[PDB]
Design a protein around this ligand. Structure first.
Ligand code: TOI
Ligand code: TOI
Ligand code: MG
Ligand code: MG
Ligand code: MG
Lengths: 537, 538, 542
């Protein structure tokens, strides 16, 4: 049967292409490549992960992909799959995550006359994916077997290349269809991919004078630049550090830089935004990919590399270091001077509890920002966050998937994965905790939940102004009164409600493979704390 | 100064700063702000404006203007089906990787679904065929925001240019640039445009990316090089036997005739660019036993072979070809050239292959050759035209019949323009087009150039008229279309002369009489026999 | 062969559904239902039309549909097909034309890895069509013959229903795919009936309207007929069917102060109409068929399908409207006589006077469709066509040809008598845009009574009447709005071997009264340098 042959060949080439994990959900139809994936999983060639929640399944795949940087497949099996995978596919697009979406259309059946149970199309595939490839029906012609083998493996390599950005340097989601109707031909020798793609470089050098008072701002997907290591650098948590000279975010308004070098895609901090939009400050964007970030339209130039002349003035260098120490002081003072535990307190505790080789998974809203404010030094540490579109959905499964993949990478040679998320974020993707006994479960994952019973970040915005006090709580705060401990145990997951002093010591000593550490926090004092911090500036 | 006028003048200015030297314009009222700004820029000599009536062939004129010198070219039109008519050109631009900017004016988006006249779903119309779909905002009546709006407008314009030229992707192609506009649409009575960067710089400077991907290839293995549309130049592969499509740039001098290829047994193939032309090439790439290596200038690589072992932009070569292998391919090449020449002589009746052979011999270094993407390209390849020193153009993206005349005219204009830019006193270089009669008739309205619009200084269109040349649709080929070419040429006031194939060479060296059509009668009845004779002569 | 059997079932059902014309173009691959269509053409159950130009083919199909109101098929067979059919599909959407676009996907072939020769997809199918239906591959299963027959005819009927608006009252283009693997008929219902019959449908949305309030009726494209509104002053676009016999000239409208407006269908003409409809002080009632209502300003008070009326127009209001109507008519007539140079407005007046009941009139966009309204054409007994969906000047030649063919085909089937005339009035730019539509092979159907009047003022005359036609732009507007071309129309028609004559406006009437070749082009030279002053003089004479 050609379909069975086709499936094994595709699965084989996917494995050759670096795919180690595949996510499935039970549906009305059986999965594309269903049986070939089973045989591959049973023989340990790949690892399968099954979920009931289709939405959290997609975010599990994102986690599995960003964990060690490998391409990951997720298989559509139902008439709700497309809708549910939407959020994950969007994040995969904007965060540039190698996500292969597997589908199986039925060419011998009618389309467009009613609802169908394996495919219900929306409009996002045409705007989010790097490629849409359909394998075409497998036909019975044994004398064309080697031609078909070459066709299937070539197309599969196209899917992988598009997903990983092998030739485009633009990773993202790919839609891969293997149409269904109702001894496996060998690939290349020694497990090589059918179509090999050697390393690729995109080179766009920009001339930059470093004697001009320069600050470096790095965001999601930023590259490593040794020739900029000396410059003062405001680096987002997910940005890899190039050097030794960090500049705290809060010290930025205290300085008047004369030019800016922007690495990757910055999404955090208003003073960062204000600075990039400053029309008198030349901005140079150094990023990988087809497009560049520039909300204001102020960027003077874009590229991938800097050709530097000169060096930063010692006066400028010293002024930056002074404001840096000043900002760091102000943050630590006002935290100590504050009795009530907030999300910012928790962030610092988690931050100082971290050790080299750890993986840190940060949720959206305050957690990702608070860690940057707590002055985390990210070197020797691998930080993940869904900054593509910054949703508070699917962060639990992301952390789980990231853990499994990061643990898998070292079993192949286990390191800790610590997640810091808000309470809303936890409630959103609570169903990601539901993992059957037959499914893979991380051995070294801890989820820290800063629970201030609502959306703390809204206290820091104009809707957090005291004149909105009576109306703000319901529509922005949104308190929920959820018993977290009861929720975790409902899913049979180890959980402790502890204070911030114990957070360090607790994280230092291991436990069950999956555990949730909950820390009670307050948000009523957040706007004042931040005001006090800038007052110390 | 009203918002529509301001916005249009900024966009035009930034486009010029981005290297746009030619703009194609089609009449309308909704695109008045663009038309005014463009006419003004043409008046001051910053760009050259080309006004056309038919949006479809206007798009192919823009394609010609782009491939004639390698610059980004805009085409501007009004809202509605005017935009939809750019569809064919956009598809061709996509697959041929042509920097074509579709600059469409639109009603404000809030008028969508309201029943407003001449309003349709424009944004996203081209789907996945374009490198990007970018919309400007509706221009605000807000003088305070003038500075911020200037930045965003110029930024978006730069995003358009980058995507079109492939400045960051190394994959040039068409971009849809939709601009919603509302009244007033004409300039105010005026007894100042917000400036761009100093010294005429682009608002956001993005230099042409260097896309590099080296690949190891052992040349001691018996190798043939097959180069198609968009192929790069490889000095370290110059000695290898090379089957090159007319639009491919030659890397060296060891030509292998297409007909010779199926009579040889290469142990590996180096594929350059995107080869679509030859069936024996298709046959060889089709059999999955022979290893194929794909070398491309951009991230795209062809699917024509299921046995592509690897991709790259350039080869890192070890070894050297067997001298016996070189001798064999060289011998078979001469054999094929002989067979074609001999069989051509042994035929009394003038066919399209004869006409193509005549045009080939008449070519000289520095010429531009524009080929109709069906028979002319194949025939020229059969005649074994040596393409060194000449620039060959053809719409090999999807090889459609549309816009061949406009593309030829556009290519001539752009080529002649690049000539003037360097202050050479010489006459403008020659552009010679070879197209079939069905192709000519179908895009005959591409000849139409308004009395006030730029005319090519040295363009000659050679029309090989064999008079029209399984399925029920084919019945229209059952009788010769009988269309008077001379009448068509008079209708659009263009010089035409019907001549014989022996007269072709001498006539082509006559001084450039601006733009002219040379009709050469040919026969297609004796063609299946001629090809069969050639095939048996091998 | 299962595929061949499938194709015959589908074609048969299509013919049962009212399809009489199918448009094809030669392509890389065989057409969908190629042989079944060929069999039907030979037997005379259906008529095939073949063109080389895929764009003009799309508009040919539109013409074949609006000519007699029948669903029409067009076959996508090439890699440029989707791109070229775009314009016609968009027009079909907005003008609500039953256009069925046939395609044949190939499931056994790779997809999305490179160039496609069956279909290179753009993004408009998602937005323009009423339905996208794929038949699914035909299986070899003699035990499943009657079931598959039922399935195929059911789906084909769905395709036809969506295109004709049988149940939605929303006609439009439909994407019908019949997949293919490369490389007699099971019967339909007895008595030639469609497999799934859709009996007459009504959408009823009555609105209460007091007609004693000073009321004007403005009727545009797709307007319905309303007997209870027949007495009212009515400003009817040429393509709108007239409910009554109390016409109100467009130029008379701003000389009146209607307290109330009933808007029928979709108006796209005249700036006074747009200004009145936007007037917040004037209640607008939109009576139209379909899902959407036209309302650019958003001022409209209510929308429905028909009016339940009380009261009646005041006799003084009728007298007032009739008086301004006579001033407008007189102004146009007097100023046309007082201006020596022939304009498009002159030509429109000549064509209008030359029409007889039973004629079909096809109007190109720009000035012609407006000039005819200004000339005061009485459209009663006349069938008037114009692509007002998106008002393109593209494809109007093939539209007229297709319209003539369908209109003549319907008259032949009555067995009556020479075919009723189709007369097209288009501008020169419009003619140049779609001149290739004249090229029709002797193998293909050709009109027997089509006459294309080309009012040639060597450019876009309508732009003289807009803001950019103001004298202060006289130095710059000739290139970018005038767009003169100096085309020899006679030579162009001669090239395609189409009968052609250049005549003066005085001769137009008599020349039109005399029949000629089945297809002929009458060219009238016109001036547009005097257009702005002519319209200004007409206004000053009101
Ligand atoms: C940061 C700013 O603005 C952002 C402030 C908050 C929201 C935000 O986007 C923030 C996302 C981010 O950039 O990290 C958040 S935080 C936020 C509260 C998170 O609360 P938490 O308890 O998880 O954490 P916290 O209490 O803040 O520590 C919410 C609801 N939302 C909206 C939201 C809605 N739905 C989904 C699926 N995803 C979402 N991100 C954004 C928004 O809704 O427009 C907003 O743009 C700013 O102006 O500086
Ligand atoms: C009538 C007004 O403005 C219209 C003025 C003209 C154009 C128009 O749309 C008119 C269509 C109509 O409503 O009937 C025309 S007339 C027109 C000139 C026609 O010249 P002609 O010689 O055929 O006729 P004429 O000389 O006017 O008798 C042009 C070019 N165009 C633009 C155009 C461009 N491309 C395509 C495919 N279709 C098009 N409609 C419209 C536009 O471009 O925005 C515009 O909306 C008004 O403001 O009242
Ligand atoms: Mg919270
Ligand atoms: Mg020919
Ligand atoms: Mg005109």
């Amino acid at each position: 049967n050609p379909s069975t042959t086709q499936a094994r060949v595709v699965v084989d080439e996917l494995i050759r292409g670096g795919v180690r994990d595949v996510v499935l959900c039970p549906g009305s139809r059986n999965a594309p490549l269903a049986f070939a994936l089973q045989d591959a999983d049973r023989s340990g060639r790949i690892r399968l992960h099954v979920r009931i929640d289709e939405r959290t399944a997609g975010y599990l795949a994102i986690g599995l992909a960003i964990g060690a940087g490998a391409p990951v497949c997720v298989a559509m099996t139902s008439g709700t799959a497309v809708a549910n995978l939407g959020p994950a596919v969007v994040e995969a697009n904007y965060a540039r995550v190698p996500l292969i979406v597997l589908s199986a259309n039925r060419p011998y059946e009618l389309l467009g006359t009613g609802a169908n149970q394996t495919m219900e199309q929306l409009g996002y595939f045409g705007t989010q994916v790097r490629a849409s490839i359909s394998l075409g029906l497998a036909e019975d012609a044994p004398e064309r077997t080697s031609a078909l083998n070459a066709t299937w493996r070539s197309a599969t390599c196209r899917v992988l290349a598009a997903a990983t950005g092998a030739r485009t340097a633009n990773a993202g989601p790919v839609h891969f269809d293997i149409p269904l109707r109702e001894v496996t031909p060998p690939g290349r020798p020694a497990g090589k991919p059918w179509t090999y793609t050697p390393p690729v470089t995109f080179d766009q050098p920009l001339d930059i004078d470093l004697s001009v008072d320069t600050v470096v701002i790095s965001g999601h997907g930023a590259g490593v630049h040794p020739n900029l290591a000396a410059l003062p650098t405001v680096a987002e948590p997910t940005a890899p550090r190039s050097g030794d000279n960090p500049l705290h975010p809060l010290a930025l308004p205290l300085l008047r830089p004369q030019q800016v070098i922007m690495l990757g895609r910055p999404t955090l901090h208003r003073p960062v935004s204000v600075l990039l939009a400053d029309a008198e400050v030349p901005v140079f964007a150094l990023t990988t990919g087809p497009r560049w970030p520039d909300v204001s339209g102020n960027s003077q130039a874009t590229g991938t590399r800097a050709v530097t002349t000169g060096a930063p003035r010692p006066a400028w260098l010293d002024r930056c270091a002074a404001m840096n120490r000043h900002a760091i002081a102000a943050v630590r003072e006002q935290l100590a001077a504050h009795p009530l535990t907030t999300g910012l307190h928790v962030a610092a505790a988690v931050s100082h509890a971290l050790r080299p080789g750890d993986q840190l998974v940060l949720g959206a809203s305050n957690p990702v920002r608070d860690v940057a404010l707590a002055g985390l030094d990210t070197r020797g540490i691998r930080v993940r966050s869904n900054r593509g579109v910054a949703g508070i959905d699917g962060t639990v499964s992301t952390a789980i998937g990231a853990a499994l993949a990061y643990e898998g990478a070292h079993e192949r040679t286990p390191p800790r994965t610590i997640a810091l998320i808000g309470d809303l974020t936890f409630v959103h993707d609570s169903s990601g905790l539901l993992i059957g006994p037959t499914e893979p479960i991380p051995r070294s994952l801890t989820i820290v939940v800063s629970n201030d019973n609502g959306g703390g970040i809204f206290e820091l915005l104009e809707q957090g102004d005291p004149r909105f006090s009576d109306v703000s709580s319901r529509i922005f705060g949104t308190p929920h009164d959820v018993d977290v401990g009861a929720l975790c145990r409902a899913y049979h997951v180890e959980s402790r409600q502890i204070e911030v002093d114990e957070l360090g010591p607790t994280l230092d000593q291991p436990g069950a493979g999956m555990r949730v550490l909950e820390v009670k926090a307050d948000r009523s004092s957040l706007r004042q704390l931040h005001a006090a911090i800038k007052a110390a500036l």
